[PDB]
Design an enzyme around this catalytic site. Structure first.
Site, mmCIF file in Angstrom:
data_model
loop_
_atom_site.group_PDB
_atom_site.id
_atom_site.type_symbol
_atom_site.label_atom_id
_atom_site.label_comp_id
_atom_site.label_asym_id
_atom_site.label_seq_id
_atom_site.Cartn_x
_atom_site.Cartn_y
_atom_site.Cartn_z
ATOM 1 N N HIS A 133 5.947 -22.908 -8.117
ATOM 2 C CA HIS A 133 4.840 -23.764 -8.692
ATOM 3 C C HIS A 133 4.917 -25.880 -9.012
ATOM 4 O O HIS A 133 3.764 -26.195 -8.971
ATOM 5 C CB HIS A 133 5.113 -23.589 -9.851
ATOM 6 C CG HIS A 133 4.626 -22.495 -10.719
ATOM 7 N ND1 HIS A 133 3.180 -21.835 -10.285
ATOM 8 C CD2 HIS A 133 6.036 -21.557 -10.996
ATOM 9 C CE1 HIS A 133 3.486 -20.323 -10.385
ATOM 10 N NE2 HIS A 133 4.976 -19.881 -11.506
ATOM 11 N N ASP A 171 7.707 -12.746 -6.798
ATOM 12 C CA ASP A 171 7.237 -13.449 -8.215
ATOM 13 C C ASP A 171 6.075 -13.218 -8.487
ATOM 14 O O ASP A 171 4.649 -13.221 -8.416
ATOM 15 C CB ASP A 171 7.632 -15.211 -7.766
ATOM 16 C CG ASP A 171 7.845 -15.297 -9.605
ATOM 17 O OD1 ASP A 171 6.479 -15.356 -10.143
ATOM 18 O OD2 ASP A 171 8.580 -15.905 -9.829
ATOM 19 N N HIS A 173 4.062 -14.721 -10.011
ATOM 20 C CA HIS A 173 2.750 -15.792 -10.568
ATOM 21 C C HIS A 173 2.869 -15.965 -8.741
ATOM 22 O O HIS A 173 3.543 -16.186 -7.741
ATOM 23 C CB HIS A 173 3.511 -16.794 -11.205
ATOM 24 C CG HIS A 173 3.396 -16.227 -12.284
ATOM 25 N ND1 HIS A 173 5.197 -16.183 -12.660
ATOM 26 C CD2 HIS A 173 2.762 -16.420 -13.696
ATOM 27 C CE1 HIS A 173 4.509 -15.816 -14.731
ATOM 28 N NE2 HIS A 173 3.280 -16.209 -14.782
ATOM 29 N N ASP A 264 10.024 -11.296 -12.374
ATOM 30 C CA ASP A 264 9.226 -11.153 -13.728
ATOM 31 C C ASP A 264 8.247 -10.463 -13.698
ATOM 32 O O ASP A 264 7.423 -10.243 -14.101
ATOM 33 C CB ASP A 264 8.712 -12.251 -14.443
ATOM 34 C CG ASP A 264 8.483 -13.860 -12.659
ATOM 35 O OD1 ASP A 264 7.618 -12.415 -11.720
ATOM 36 O OD2 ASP A 264 7.994 -14.655 -13.182
ATOM 37 N N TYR A 304 12.358 -13.406 -16.632
ATOM 38 C CA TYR A 304 12.957 -13.607 -17.511
ATOM 39 C C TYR A 304 13.586 -12.745 -18.683
ATOM 40 O O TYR A 304 13.896 -12.992 -20.160
ATOM 41 C CB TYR A 304 11.974 -14.197 -18.477
ATOM 42 C CG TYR A 304 12.052 -15.559 -17.251
ATOM 43 C CD1 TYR A 304 12.130 -16.441 -17.615
ATOM 44 C CD2 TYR A 304 10.347 -15.207 -16.980
ATOM 45 C CE1 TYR A 304 11.878 -17.853 -16.430
ATOM 46 C CE2 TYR A 304 9.541 -15.859 -16.104
ATOM 47 C CZ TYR A 304 10.367 -17.716 -15.471
ATOM 48 O OH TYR A 304 10.160 -18.517 -15.270
HETATM 49 C C1 LIG Z 1 8.841 -20.731 -25.180
HETATM 50 N N1 LIG Z 1 8.152 -19.221 -24.740
HETATM 51 C C2 LIG Z 1 8.651 -17.898 -25.099
HETATM 52 C C3 LIG Z 1 6.878 -19.640 -23.328
HETATM 53 C C4 LIG Z 1 6.191 -20.213 -23.527
HETATM 54 C C5 LIG Z 1 5.306 -20.859 -21.702
HETATM 55 C C6 LIG Z 1 4.670 -18.898 -21.532
HETATM 56 C C7 LIG Z 1 3.673 -18.710 -20.910
HETATM 57 O O1 LIG Z 1 2.542 -17.983 -21.360
HETATM 58 N N2 LIG Z 1 3.499 -19.465 -19.448
HETATM 59 C C8 LIG Z 1 1.922 -19.206 -18.759
HETATM 60 C C9 LIG Z 1 0.989 -19.780 -19.269
HETATM 61 O O2 LIG Z 1 0.397 -19.249 -19.382
HETATM 62 N N3 LIG Z 1 0.857 -20.726 -20.349
HETATM 63 C C10 LIG Z 1 0.050 -21.206 -20.998
HETATM 64 C C11 LIG Z 1 -0.472 -20.782 -22.320
HETATM 65 C C12 LIG Z 1 -1.787 -20.876 -22.945
HETATM 66 C C13 LIG Z 1 -1.654 -20.204 -24.527
HETATM 67 C C14 LIG Z 1 -1.438 -19.009 -25.071
HETATM 68 C C15 LIG Z 1 -0.388 -18.537 -23.353
HETATM 69 C C16 LIG Z 1 0.065 -19.378 -22.073
HETATM 70 C C17 LIG Z 1 4.233 -20.564 -18.856
HETATM 71 C C18 LIG Z 1 5.315 -19.613 -17.798
HETATM 72 C C19 LIG Z 1 5.167 -20.873 -16.588
HETATM 73 C C20 LIG Z 1 6.160 -20.619 -15.685
HETATM 74 C C21 LIG Z 1 6.700 -19.482 -15.037
HETATM 75 C C22 LIG Z 1 7.429 -19.026 -13.931
HETATM 76 O O3 LIG Z 1 8.009 -19.821 -12.852
HETATM 77 N N4 LIG Z 1 7.634 -17.857 -14.056
HETATM 78 O O4 LIG Z 1 8.785 -17.249 -12.518
HETATM 79 C C23 LIG Z 1 6.714 -18.402 -16.455
HETATM 80 C C24 LIG Z 1 5.780 -19.181 -17.704
HETATM 81 C C25 LIG Z 1 5.405 -17.859 -22.423
HETATM 82 C C26 LIG Z 1 6.388 -17.987 -22.749
HETATM 83 K K LIG Z 2 3.738 -14.780 -6.044
HETATM 84 ZN ZN LIG Z 3 7.371 -16.289 -12.146
#
Ligand SMILES: CN(C)c1ccc(C(=O)N(CC(=O)NCc2ccccc2)Cc2ccc(C(=O)NO)cc2)cc1
Ligand SMILES: [K+]
Ligand SMILES: [Zn+2]
Ligand SMILES: [K+]
Length: 357
Positions: A133, A171, A173, A264, A304
């Site tokens: 990312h 991945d 994402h 993931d 995760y």
């Molecule tokens: C602390 N805890 C339990 C979380 C925190 C953030 C998320 C989450 O949702 N994100 C994605 C996202 O959309 N955030 C915006 C958002 C706004 C409002 C509501 C929900 C989400 C973060 C994220 C970024 C990169 C990777 C990755 O690199 N994976 O390989 C993974 C996860 C989940 C649990």
């Molecule tokens: K990917």
């Molecule tokens: Zn990811």
């Protein structure tokens, strides 16, 4: 024909100092490593030593401003670390994040060097924090520097500038950072399979859609396989490898294969929402091993569920070691939206790949 492995417990020092329950836990890599010992995969591998990336090596893909900003975090008190991380999308920083980021990149450099000099046939890199990312000028989504992108450039620096590198990003994402870095480049073919949901899934950008095929000389060298409305699993990823990933890869003819291996999308992940099995990842690895004279480097990205990522990555290492691939369905019909996605990508990339006709 040996498999390399690189792991250093110093990459556990990076952590979220305001939330001990954050999914990007230090125990992600220690649990993966411990599973390699329990399954006796570690003693079958050749231990590659980790090292620190240099700022010159980091400058292959990132701006001087971004490198100097991440480096300055080393000296900050917690109050200023929190402010700095809040300027980014989904980033937490501690006083050791820079060193851990240096170790993740330097470790994959040593692994690519071991592969390209013939010391090992292939390798696995159990590293954190992830990288795909991370953009040229900014950090994003728990990533500071783009480890897979840097490794492809480092690989070209120790062989030749035009070394053809394939980056397969399974991945869950979209690797927005890797795509933008090589968007105009025809020496690095980027292929990403990712949950998309019409741009509603992180990183929430339409850049991840199937119609983004590359720019300039890079047209055709960016392959986005976006999933929509469906719990994609082994049948969908196998069919995407049979119709898109492998026929394009064999025509591109890579000299080196880097896998942004996030887990993931595995069954049981708390945020991915897919159900890829460890045997599914094993099958995908065995496929990629038929490319580039078997020179595959598997780099840990996301994932995760500690049990899921440990069993999934262990299955990948077992394939690199030469164990027999699992027998899977093949006759399981795909979800309808997956056939739509695969057909959309075939349509967008048929002009650029004669094997897709
Ligand atoms: C602390 N805890 C339990 C979380 C925190 C953030 C998320 C989450 O949702 N994100 C994605 C996202 O959309 N955030 C915006 C958002 C706004 C409002 C509501 C929900 C989400 C973060 C994220 C970024 C990169 C990777 C990755 O690199 N994976 O390989 C993974 C996860 C989940 C649990
Ligand atoms: K990917
Ligand atoms: Zn990811
Ligand atoms: K590209």
């Amino acid at each position: 024909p040996i498999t390399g492995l690189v792991y250093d417990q110093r990459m556990m020092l990076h952590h979220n100092m305001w939330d001990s329950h954050h999914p990007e836990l230090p125990q992600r890599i220690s649990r993966i490593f411990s599973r390699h010992e329990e399954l006796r995969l570690l003693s079958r591998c050749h231990r590659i030593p980790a090292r620190l990336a240099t700022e010159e090596e980091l400058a292959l893909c990132h701006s001087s401003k971004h490198i100097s900003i991440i480096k300055s975090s080393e000296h900050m008190k917690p109050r200023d670390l929190n402010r700095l991380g809040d300027e980014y999308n989904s980033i937490f920083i501690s006083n050791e994040s820079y060193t851990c980021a240096l170790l993740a990149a330097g470790s994959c450099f040593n692994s690519a060097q071991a592969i390209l000099t013939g010391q090992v046939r292939n390798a696995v890199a159990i590293v954190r924090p992830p990288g795909h990312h991370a953009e040229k000028d900014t950090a994003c989504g728990f990533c500071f520097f783009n480890t897979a992108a840097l490794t492809a450039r480092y690989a070209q620096s120790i062989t030749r500038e035009s070394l053809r590198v394939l980056i397969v990003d399974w991945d869950v994402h979209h690797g927005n950072g890797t795509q933008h870095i090589f968007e105009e480049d025809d020496s690095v073919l980027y292929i990403s399979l990712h949950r998309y949901e019409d741009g509603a899934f992180f990183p929430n950008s339409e850049d991840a859609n199937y119609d983004k095929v590359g720019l300039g000389k890079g047209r055709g060298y960016n392959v986005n396989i976006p999933w929509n409305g469906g719990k994609m699993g082994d049948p969908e990823y196998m069919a995407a490898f049979h119709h898109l990933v492998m026929p394009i890869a064999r025509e591109f003819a890579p000299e080196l294969v880097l896998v942004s291996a996030g887990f993931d999308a595995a069954r049981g992940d708390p945020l991915g929402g897919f159900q890829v099995t460890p045997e599914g990842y094993a099958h995908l690895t065995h496929q990629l091993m038929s490319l580039a004279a078997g020179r595959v480097l598997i780099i840990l990205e996301g994932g995760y569920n500690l049990t899921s990522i440990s069993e999934s990555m262990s299955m990948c290492t077992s394939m690199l070691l030469g164990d027999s691939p699992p027998s899977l369905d093949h006759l399981t019909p795909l979800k309808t939206s997956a056939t739509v996605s695969i057909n959309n990508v075939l349509r967008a990339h048929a002009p650029f790949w004669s094997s897709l006709r």
